[PDB]
Write an enzyme that holds these catalytic residues in place. Structure first.
Site, PDB file in Angstrom:
ATOM      1  NE  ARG A 106      -3.722  -2.485   0.689  1.00 47.47           N
ATOM      2  CZ  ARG A 106      -4.244  -3.397  -0.102  1.00 47.47           C
ATOM      3  NH1 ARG A 106      -3.889  -3.497  -1.371  1.00 47.47           N
ATOM      4  NH2 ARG A 106      -5.114  -4.240   0.415  1.00 47.47           N
ATOM      5  NE  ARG A 166      -2.881 -11.524  -0.685  1.00 45.84           N
ATOM      6  CZ  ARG A 166      -4.127 -11.498  -0.213  1.00 45.84           C
ATOM      7  NH1 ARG A 166      -5.128 -12.011  -0.932  1.00 45.84           N
ATOM      8  NH2 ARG A 166      -4.364 -11.027   1.006  1.00 45.84           N
ATOM      9  CE  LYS A 196      -3.398 -10.805   4.963  1.00 44.58           C
ATOM     10  NZ  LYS A 196      -3.630  -9.385   4.488  1.00 44.58           N
ATOM     11  CG  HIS A 197      -7.086 -14.472   4.601  1.00 50.19           C
ATOM     12  ND1 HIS A 197      -6.113 -14.634   3.652  1.00 50.19           N
ATOM     13  CD2 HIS A 197      -7.389 -13.146   4.616  1.00 50.19           C
ATOM     14  CE1 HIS A 197      -5.787 -13.448   3.151  1.00 50.19           C
ATOM     15  NE2 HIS A 197      -6.564 -12.537   3.701  1.00 50.19           N
ATOM     16  CG  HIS A 209     -11.678  -9.527  -2.662  1.00 50.94           C
ATOM     17  ND1 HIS A 209     -10.625 -10.414  -2.573  1.00 50.94           N
ATOM     18  CD2 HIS A 209     -11.354  -8.478  -1.873  1.00 50.94           C
ATOM     19  CE1 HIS A 209      -9.710  -9.921  -1.764  1.00 50.94           C
ATOM     20  NE2 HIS A 209     -10.127  -8.752  -1.320  1.00 50.94           N
ATOM     21  CG  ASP A 293     -10.744 -10.865   4.549  1.00 51.51           C
ATOM     22  OD1 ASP A 293     -10.300  -9.677   4.442  1.00 51.51           O
ATOM     23  OD2 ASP A 293     -10.515 -11.759   3.688  1.00 51.51           O
TER      24      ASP A 293
HETATM   25 NA    NA Z   1     -11.777 -14.111   3.040  1.00 44.90          NA
HETATM   26 NA    NA Z   2      -8.574  -8.275   3.012  1.00 41.46          NA
END
Ligand code: NA
Ligand code: NA
Length: 617
Positions: A106, A166, A196-197, A209, A293
Site C-alpha cells: 500500500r 501471496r 491470515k486467513h 472478494h 476479513d
Molecule cells: Na476471506
Molecule cells: Na482483506
C-alpha cells in the site's frame, strides 16, 4: 509479571468504559475515500478533515484500516496518522494496513519487496524475518502500528485467484517457517501482526472478494495442512488472526438463507462460532485478537445484511469487525449508528453476553498495551516525525535488501545450452514482450540502466504489449528482426486451451491472449533461431505453457514501472539474471502441473537451476 500486569490493566480500563465505548473498540472501519460537504463524489482521503474526525470522536472506533489511497506519500501519511490519533478521544487507534510485500503493498514510497512466494523460492527463514523487520520499521516511522501480515494460507490449489503468490508455498512447513519469521520480524518492531486467513484460504478456486468459496476437505486434511502454520505461529505468540470468508463444512455445516437468492448456504468461517470459538479460541488456544476479513467483501455482503454480518461475527467470537460499513460522507454516518445499535440489541437480549464484549475489548486493549500503542510513546512533533520517516521509508539500505531478496528468489526452470545469460554484441536488437505497458517499461528501464552502467553493450530496444491482442504478421516481423527476445507471461489461473495434451495454437482471435500470444512469439522465435527467454510474472504455473522454450525463469511478481517508480522488484531481478548481473538461487515453492500430460507434475517443488551450470540447486 508484565503479562500479568497487562491483563489487570486492560481489565481496569475496560471496566470504566461505557457499552458504546466498548462496542466502538470492536469496530475498525476504513475511510479510503471521502466526499466532503460541497464535493460531488468520494475522493482519496490523504488528509484528515473535521468530518471524518467527528465520526472518530462520535463512535470511538478501536482502529482504522488504511489503503493505498490513504498512504501515497510518506509526509502525508505521517500527518494523517498523527491526525487520526489526535481525533481519537480516549484510546489510541490501531492503524492497520495490508503491507504484505510483493503483489500486496500500500505504501506509495515504501519498500515493496518481492512477496511471499518469492520468499518461499528463496527458502531461508531469516529472509522473511528481514522482510518483516524492514516493513515493520517503515510502518513504525509512518505511525502505522498494525500489519495484516503474514498470509499463512498454503496455495495448494494452483487455480486459487486470490492467494497465489501471496502464499509462501504449497508446503505446510515452508509456509509455517516463513510465516513465523515474518511475524517475529514485525513484532520486533512493535507492529501488531495478523495471521491470515483462518482457517486457511489456500485451497479455494473462488475469490472471496467476489463470491463465497467452499473448501470441502475433511477435518484430518484441514488439521494436517490448512491449520498447521496457524498453530505454529499461535504457539509462538501471534497477536491477531484474521478470518476467511470461506465455507468449511467439515468444521461447521450450519446453513443460513442467503439474502441473494434465498438458498441455503453453508456458513462462512467468519460467522461460524464452531470455527472461531470452538476451533481457534478453544482447541488451538488462541487468546489474541480475532479480526474479520473485510465485511464488504461479496462472500459476506451478497449473503448477509450489513448489521447482521457484524452481529453474527461477534456471536461467532470475533473481537474486531473490519470494515463493517462503508461511510463515504456525513450523509451516510448513521450506517455506523445502526451497526452499534444492532450490537446493543444483541447484548440487551443476552445473545451476546456483555461479558463476551468485555473479554473482546480486553484483548484489544491488551494488544494496544503490548505493542506500545497505549500509552502513546512518541513525543516528537509531526514535523520531526516526518523528517525521520523520510530517511527510513524507502531508504537506500531497504532498497538494497529488497534487491538482494528479489534476485535470490528468481527461479531458473530451463536454460539449455547456456542460452542464458544473454551477452549481446553492440547494436543487438532486444525485443521486449509483455502483457502490459508497465511491464515492458520495467524491463526496458532495467536494460537501459545496464547499458548506462556499462554492464552490457549498447543495444536497441523495442516493446510489444500483448494484452487483448491477436498475434499478427506485424508481430512476427518484429520477432524476425530481433536478435534477442524477452517475453513475460502473466496468469492467475492457468487456463491454456488444450486438447489431448496439445496446446491449441490455432486460435486466431484475442480470446485467449494470455497463453496464445506468448506461445506464438515463442514459436516464431524458435523457428527463426532467436535467443528467447520466457519470464513467468505472476503465478508460476504458466511455465507449463512453454515446454518448447530453451530458457525459462519465474519471478513471482508482475507489477511494472510507472511514474518513475518500480512497483515491484521482481521483474528487474529477472532481467538482471537474464543478462548475467544477478545470481538466482530460487527453487520452486510449489509444484508446477503439466499441461501437456494432465495429472503429471512438470516441475516439482524444490526444483531450480544454477544459471551458470544448468544443473539443479
Ligand atoms: Na476471506
Ligand atoms: Na482483506
Amino acid at each position: 509479571a508484565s503479562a500479568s500486569k497487562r491483563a489487570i490493566d486492560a481489565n481496569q480500563i475496560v471496566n470504566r468504559m461505557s457499552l458504546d465505548e466498548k462496542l466502538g473498540q470492536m469496530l475498525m472501519p476504513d475511510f479510503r475515500n471521502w466526499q466532503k460537504e460541497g464535493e460531488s463524489s468520494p475522493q482519496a482521503l490523504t488528509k484528515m478533515n473535521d468530518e471524518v474526525a467527528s465520526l472518530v470522536k462520535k463512535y470511538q472506533f478501536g482502529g482504522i484500516i488504511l489503503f493505498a489511497e490513504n498512504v501515497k506519500t510518506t509526509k502525508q501519511t505521517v500527518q494523517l496518522t498523527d491526525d487520526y490519533q489526535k481525533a481519537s478521544p480516549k484510546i489510541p487507534l490501531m492503524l492497520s494496513i495490508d503491507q504484505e510485500g510483493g503483489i500486496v503493498t500500500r505504501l506509495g514510497e515504501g519498500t515493496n519487496f518481492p512477496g511471499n512466494m518469492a520468499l518461499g523460492a528463496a527458502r531461508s527463514r531469516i529472509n522473511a524475518y528481514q522482510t518483516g523487520s524492514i516493513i515493520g520499521k517503515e510502518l513504525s516511522a509512518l505511525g502505522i502500528n498494525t500489519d495484516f501480515s503474514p498470509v499463512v494460507d498454503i496455495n495448494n490449489n494452483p487455480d486459487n485467484p486470490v492467494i497465489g503468490v501471496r502464499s509462501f508455498s504449497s508446503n505446510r512447513e515452508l509456509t509455517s517457517r516463513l510465516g513465523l519469521y515474518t511475524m517475529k520480524g514485525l513484532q520486533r518492531q512493535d507492529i501488531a501482526s495478523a495471521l491470515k486467513h483462518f482457517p486457511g484460504h489456500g485451497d479455494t478456486d473462488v475469490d472471496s472478494h467476489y463470491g463465497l468459496p467452499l473448501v470441502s476437505h475433511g477435518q484430518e486434511r484441514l488439521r494436517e495442512v490448512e491449520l498447521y502454520p496457524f498453530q505454529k505461529a499461535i504457539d509462538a505468540g501471534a497477536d491477531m488472526v484474521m478470518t476467511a470468508h470461506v465455507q468449511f463444512p467439515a468444521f461447521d455445516d450450519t446453513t443460513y438463507k442467503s439474502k441473494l437468492d434465498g438458498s441455503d448456504i453453508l456458513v462462512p468461517a467468519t460467522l461460524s462460532k464452531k470455527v472461531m470459538t470452538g476451533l481457534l479460541r478453544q482447541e488451538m488456544g488462541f487468546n489474541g485478537v480475532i479480526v474479520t476479513d473485510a465485511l464488504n467483501m461479496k462472500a459476506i455482503a451478497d449473503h448477509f445484511g450489513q448489521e447482521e454480518a457484524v452481529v453474527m461475527a461477534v456471536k461467532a467470537g470475533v473481537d474486531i469487525a473490519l470494515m463493517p460499513a462503508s461511510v463515504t460522507s456525513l450523509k451516510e454516518e448513521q450506517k455506523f449508528a445502526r451497526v452499534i445499535q444492532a450490537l446493543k440489541e444483541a447484548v440487551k437480549n443476552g445473545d451476546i453476553p456483555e461479558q463476551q464484549i468485555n473479554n473482546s475489548v480486553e484483548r484489544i486493549i491488551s494488544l494496544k498495551i503490548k505493542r506500545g500503542m497505549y500509552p502513546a510513546r512518541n513525543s516528537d512533533s509531526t514535523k520531526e516525525k516526518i523528517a525521520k520517516a523520510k530517511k527510513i521509508v524507502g531508504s537506500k539500505q531497504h532498497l538494497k535488501a529488497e534487491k538482494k531478496l528479489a534476485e535470490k528468489a528468481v527461479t531458473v526452470l530451463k536454460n539449455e545450452q547456456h542460452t542464458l545469460p544473454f551477452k549481446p554484441k553492440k547494436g543487438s536488437r532486444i525485443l521486449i514482450v509483455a502483457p502490459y505497458e508497465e511491464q515492458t517499461a520495467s524491463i526496458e528501464q532495467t536494460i537501459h540502466d545496464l547499458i548506462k552502467r556499462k554492464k552490457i553493450k549498447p543495444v536497441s530496444l523495442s516493446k510489444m504489449n500483448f494484452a487483448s491482442q491477436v498475434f499478427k504478421t506485424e508481430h512476427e516481423k518484429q520477432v524476425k528482426e530481433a536478435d534477442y527476445i524477452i517475453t513475460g507471461s502473466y496468469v492467475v489461473k492457468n487456463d491454456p486451451v488444450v486438447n489431448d495434451g496439445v496446446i491449441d495454437d490455432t486460435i486466431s482471435d484475442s480470446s485467449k491472449w494470455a497463453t496464445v500470444f506468448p506461445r506464438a512469439v515463442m514459436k516464431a522465435a524458435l523457428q527463426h533461431n532467436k535467443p528467447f527467454v520466457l519470464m513467468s510474472l505472476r503465478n508460476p504455473y504458466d511455465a507449463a505453457n512453454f515446454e518448447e522454450a530453451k530458457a525459462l525463469i519465474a519471478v513471482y511478481g508482475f507489477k511494472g514501472y510507472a511514474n518513475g517508480r518500480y512497483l515491484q522488484p521482481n521483474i528487474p531481478a529477472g532481467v538482471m539474471a537474464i543478462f548475467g548481473q544477478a545470481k538466482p538461487k530460487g527453487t520452486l515453492p510449489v509444484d508446477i502441473p503439466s499441461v501437456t500430460k494432465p495429472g503429471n507434475t512438470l516441475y516439482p517443488l524444490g526444483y531450480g537451476l544454477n544459471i551458470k551450470t544448468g544443473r539443479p540447486l
